[PDB]
Each structure stands twice: as C-alpha cells, then as structure tokens.
Symmetry: C2
Subunit: 412 residues, 2 copies
C-alpha cells in the first residue's frame, strides 16, 4: 500500500515530485484494475496540483459523493451518467489542500448490501466488503494513498478490515455530508482509508485544518478497554485470533488492558440501529422507491419492502434509546482511553456468497458517533483481520494516536 | 388567503373535486403573480392527484429544495437551468400524501441576504422578507394553501410576519434536509407557510404521519411567558405594538401571561449564532466560493469574503456555547407552556432599502431548535405585524395549538 505521510515527506524534501507521485498512482491503478475493479471511472488525465499539503496525493472518491468534473452514479443504473453540478464539500476540502481527484471508486447501489464487481486485493475470490468497496480495495491494492468512503452501518471499518487497510470513521458530523447521497441522516458519516493511522491524521489535518491532527504521535501506555459485543452474536475464530494478538502486543508494548461489559443501555442502542437506519432510508430514498422501485438493486429493494411499515412512533422510541445509549457510554470512558473490539465477523466472505459481510460489530459505534479506527492485525488463510480502536466522541486525534501505538506494538 | 384545512374538509365531503381545487390555485397564481413575482417557475400543467389527504392541495416549493420535474436554481445564476435528478424527501412526503407541486418559489441567492424581485402582497413597495421570499408572498397573496421554505437565521418566521401568513419552523431535524441546498447544517431547518395554524398542523400530519399532529385543537388558557430578547436590541414601534395587542388578546381569552428573562447562557447562544452559520457556510459553499467567487450575489459574496478567517477553534467554542444555551433554555419551559416574542424587527422594509429584514429576533430559536410559529396580529400602514409562539423542543403540536388559541383570541 502507498503511504500518504511518506509521499508528503518525500515531496516536501524535494525527493519526489508531485507529478511523479501522481503518475505512479495512475500506473498502479492500470496495473491492477483488470484484477480488482475498484474504480467506476479512472480520470487518466488527472494531474497533480501546484501547492498544498496534499499536492501529489491521489485520492479515490466513493461514487455516492458528488464530483463536478466526473459523473456520480451512486452504484445504480438509476443514476447512470448523472453529473453533479458541484463538488461535495468534502471533495473541496481535499482539492483546496492540493489533492488530486484521480477517480470514483465503486459503491454498492445507494450504499446498500448489493455486491459490486470489486474484488479483494488479497484474494480475488473474496469480497472487499461494502458498501465502500472500491475505496477499501483500491487502497488495499496499493493503487492510491487515500480514499473517501462512508459509514451508516459499517461501510468504512468493515471493508477496511477485510482489505487490510487503515481507516477511520471520524466523530459523527465532523466531516460534512453535504453532497453525499443520504441513506440515514442520523447515521451517515464520511470516512477515510489509508495505509496507516499516521496517513489518516495527515489527511484529516489537511482537510479540516484542525491543530489536534497536527504533530500527532503514537500514544504511550494507553488504557485499553476490551469489549466483545456479545449482544452482537458469536464471532468467527479468525476475528478472535486477531483481537487476542492485538491485546497481547498492546500489553507487551506497555498498555494496560482490561475486559469490560457495556451497559445494558448500550446493548439496546445496538438493537435499534436497524430501526433508525431503515425508517430514515424510506424517507431519504422516497423518490427512488416511489418512481423507480423495480430499478432498485435486489437486496436493497428487499430491505426497503420489508420496512415500509416502520412507524414514526417506534422510530422516535428508537432514537430515544440511542440517546440513552450515548449518555451511558460516556461513563465507560472514565477508566479507559479507548475501547478495543472486532472490526468484522471474521475474514472476508467468498464472492460466491454474494455478501459484503455483516456490520453487526460496527453499527453500534456509528449510532454512538464515536471516532473509530481500523488497525490491521494479521492474516488467516491469506485474508486480513483487524481490530477496531474506539475513543470518546470528539477525540478523533486520540483514536489515531492509539491506533498508531497499536500498529507499532504489533510490529513488535 | 387559501386555507388548506378548509380545502381538505370540502374535498373530503365531495363538495369540491381535487381538480377544481388545483384549478383554483392556478387561477389564483395567474391573477397576482405578474405583480408579486413570487414564483421562479409556475407549472401550469400541474394536475391534482386522485387520493391521499392532500389531494387537491397545491404547494409552492422554495427554489433551494430539489424537484425532479422542475429546475432548482438556488436563486443564483450559478445554477441557472440546474435540474436535480430526484425530488427531495420533503417534496416526496407531500406528493405521497396526494399533494400537487404547483411550482418553485423565489429564494434569495443561496438563501442569503441578496434580495429577490419578489414583492410584498400587502404593498408592492415593500419586501416580502427573506430568504423564503416567494413562499411567504405566494401564500400571503392568496395564491396557494401551502408552501415550503427554510430557516437558518429567520427565513421562515420573518417573511411570514412581513406577509401576514401563518408559518412554522418545526423542531430541528424533524423534517429531513436532504435535497435541500445547505448553508449551515447545524441550523438549516425546513418550514411551512399557510393561512392559519390549523393549516400547518394538517400539512405536517400528512407529511410526517405523526399522531401528535392529529386531532389538534385550540389550546385553553395557556401559560405564556413573554420574552423581548433584549440582547438583540429594541424593536421598532410597530413590532412592540403588535406584541402588546397579542398579550392583551390572550389575557382577555383566559391565558396567563408573564414577562420572563432569558438565562445568560441563552443570550450568549444568540451572540455566537453568526460564528456557526458563517463558519459552516464556507465549507458548505466551498465549490461556489472557490470556482465561482465573482458570480456569487454581492451581499453574500461580501459576508463570505469577510469571514474566510473564522477558525475551527472559535467554531467549536461557539457550538459549546450553543449546547449550553439549549440545556438552560429547557429549564425555562418548566414554569411556562410557551414563549411569546417578536417575529421581526417591525413592518416589512421598503424595497428601496435593499434588505430582507434583520433576523436578530429569529436566529436564537433556530439554533436552539425549538418549534416556532408566526401568528399574524395586526397591520400598520397596511403592513402586517406578527408575533412568534415558541414551545419546547419536540412540542410542535402544542406550539400550533397555542398559536391557534392566539388567533381566536385576536379575532375576539
């Protein structure tokens, strides 16, 4: 994989030129696209910008995020050829920083469960996860140093884990969702994919200009709280192996680790996530559901059809339950700096299963809003397994700091 | 003005056909549009639907809200001829209920300060207010029974007051802002314009399907708390005259009225509203500011140029102040059912002043999130003056109930 931070340093010290860096991504993409299929469209004419911390940095954009110079097809035929008038605010944050929008990465139809043609870089016979399939695969394939995606359930953390890349789902609403195809406004959150935690930090620094993302360094002797989200059902062996490896490395590295059970209120929040997501989806995708019902991908159309009956009453109750969950989750962070848990059920499912994986270990955190970071741990049968580092709401900088510490710890 | 609730009843009993109702609206728009200029686009072919609670109900849509069959130009040359692919969720809520989207109403460029060509129905020499100019003017001129607008500062309540129409800015996020041109995601709120409070209730009921809007009836002897928002300075004579008239009518109607002071925390919330609005504006309008700077309307362009320096730091601090205000405000709604204040600085400004009016008496409430309702009280020099009814967050129904009460009390 390509490191954003590495590219920056080399460009800053005249070692590498912005153009060369971009040309390299162009090459990397063409070298493996026929095998990975991570891009809906590759803008081969894309050139590096003159200035900015992100000059020479090629970025892939999930195809539900608006771009003015390239179509935004939402992974659906309904939007074939669709061309937004303006660039989404998040795309502009990148451009203003000197980044190069190299292309649009594949997304499941409307960011749902319907598989794309994209394949896992580690094993062509496996899924790269979803819904941010192309962003994760492209970064995992070493095509680009950065990519944007989104998470409502777990479309940032899950595919990152599956493809073995670093990634972060910042605190809810930190990054604007304007110009981002909505599924559930109460959940939709923009995320970033990169090689390591440090790359994510530099990416967020350039995008937001927030000092907290500047000068970040690996955390020392972090206080980790391990949660296995039992309420989410049984996990696959490979996932537990990864978690245990992480815990062990962390301990050897000097961290303090303790197992803790989440409050019953938090469990409840996890349970009603589907209610909030599905109710709002009917509102957010009202036009598509009413005017182009039969054109909606199979799986998405099935979930919508099965949820037309959700009532405003139960919806409101679900949100109330979510709030309680957030309130009680905060107390948990009085003893620990971050929470460590699974990033996915296990290794990436085989493409033959026609599944982008289950977000049951991700969804709770999207609703809580806390910043989440994926840390690649190991590989089983050649397929990546990662862990999820979660910090207090708004403490994105610390989450990255701890993920960094964890990366170094695993490196022994 | 055309009453939505009135049409519903007559249509329901078979006294009025939906087709006739819609024909009525077209004729009404035709008779006053050439002088008011409230519509950016009037769809003369718009027909009535056969079923649903809003069948036969014509609705005007502010032109920052997406429509799939009509252009959405944001009141700016930058979006001349721009055609969204889909109808915004709020528009779909109306259509699914059987409503007829009769056209797009004028909006200031990107919902800011730059005046539109729309004129006040009560006096063409005055402003209809902004930024929801067309929606307020159209309803105020008796053209349509319902219209959608938006409020970030006071673009719902203020123009409603200026045009003498009933209107409501629902609780924050109760109505989706998807497909609604964003200015400030922390403030942007969809609102409705109608003849009377009852009309607003019926509209929300059909749109949301929430039982809280069903069976709404005038309130009895409500506990009103009068607040003059001193932090915003003194209002114009006409405005005070209207408030005094409202208080007197309410008292003689059996209501308990008492003057109340707003906690310092709330005052501060009002003060930092500009910080939040302007900071986000730069992110939300990044493409426009960076790629079409000189094409942006004069006033909005100047305010943007003057705020480029706002830091994320002062922004975060501003939000913290806002949250603090929200908590203490709730405490206020413990001894009183609703608050009563000004809807605007006074009568509608003369067009010559090139001003849509000062929203200093509206902005606080948009940030607090509380449901606000404008109640027409009287006229000065032929220009309408209204008052603003405010209830606790999520108590929209009660707000409407009390507003209805005030309407009846004013009629004596």
């Amino acid at each position: 994989m390509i490191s954003l931070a590495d590219l920056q340093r080399r460009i800053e010290t005249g070692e590498l030129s912005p153009n060369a860096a971009i040309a390299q991504s162009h090459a990397a993409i063409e070298a493996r696209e026929k095998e990975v299929h991570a891009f809906v469209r590759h803008d081969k004419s894309a050139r590096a910008q003159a200035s900015g911390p992100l000059r020479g940095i090629a970025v892939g954009i999930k195809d539900i995020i608006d771009t003015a110079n390239m179509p935004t097809e939402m992974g659906s035929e309904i939007y074939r050829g669709w061309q937004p008038r303006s660039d989404a605010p998040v795309v502009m944050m990148l451009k203003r920083a000197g980044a190069t929008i190299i292309g649009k990465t594949t997304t499941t139809a409307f960011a749902s469960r319907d598989p794309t043609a994209t394949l896992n870089p580690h094993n062509t016979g496996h899924s790269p996860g979803g819904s941010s399939s192309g962003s994760a695969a492209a970064v995992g394939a070493g095509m680009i140093p950065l990519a944007l995606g989104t998470q409502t359930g777990g479309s940032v953390i899950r595919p990152a884990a599956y493809c073995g890349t670093a990634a972060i789902k910042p605190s809810f609403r930190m990054l604007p969702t304007v110009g981002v195809k909505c599924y559930s406004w109460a959940l939709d959150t923009v995320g970033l994919f990169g090689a390591r935690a440090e790359d994510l930090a530099r990416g967020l620094l350039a995008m937001t200009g927030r000092s907290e993302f500047s000068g970040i360094v690996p955390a020392k002797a972090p206080r980790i709280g391990v949660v296995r989200q039992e309420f989410a059902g049984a996990v696959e062996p490979a996932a537990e192996q990864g978690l245990q490896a992480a815990i062990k490395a962390a301990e050897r590295a000097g961290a303090s680790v303790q197992a803790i059970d989440l409050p019953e209120a938090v469990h409840e929040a996890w349970r009603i996530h589907p209610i909030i997501q599905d109710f709002e989806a009917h509102r957010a995708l009202a036009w598509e559901f009413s005017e182009h019902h039969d054109e909606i991908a199979p799986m998405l159309r099935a979930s919508l059809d099965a949820t037309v009956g959700l009532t405003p009453k139960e919806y409101d109750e679900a949100r109330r339950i979510g709030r309680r969950g957030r309130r009680e989750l905060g107390e948990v962070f009085e003893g620990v700096d971050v929470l460590l848990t699974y990033s996915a059920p296990g290794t990436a499912p085989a493409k033959a299963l026609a599944s982008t994986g289950d977000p049951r270990y991700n969804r709770l955190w999207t609703l809580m809003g806390n910043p989440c970071v994926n840390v690649p741990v190991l590989k089983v049968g050649g397929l990546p397994i990662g862990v999820q580092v979660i910090a207090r709401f708004g403490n994105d900088a610390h989450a990255l700091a701890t993920a960094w510490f964890l990366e170094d710890a695993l490196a022994k």
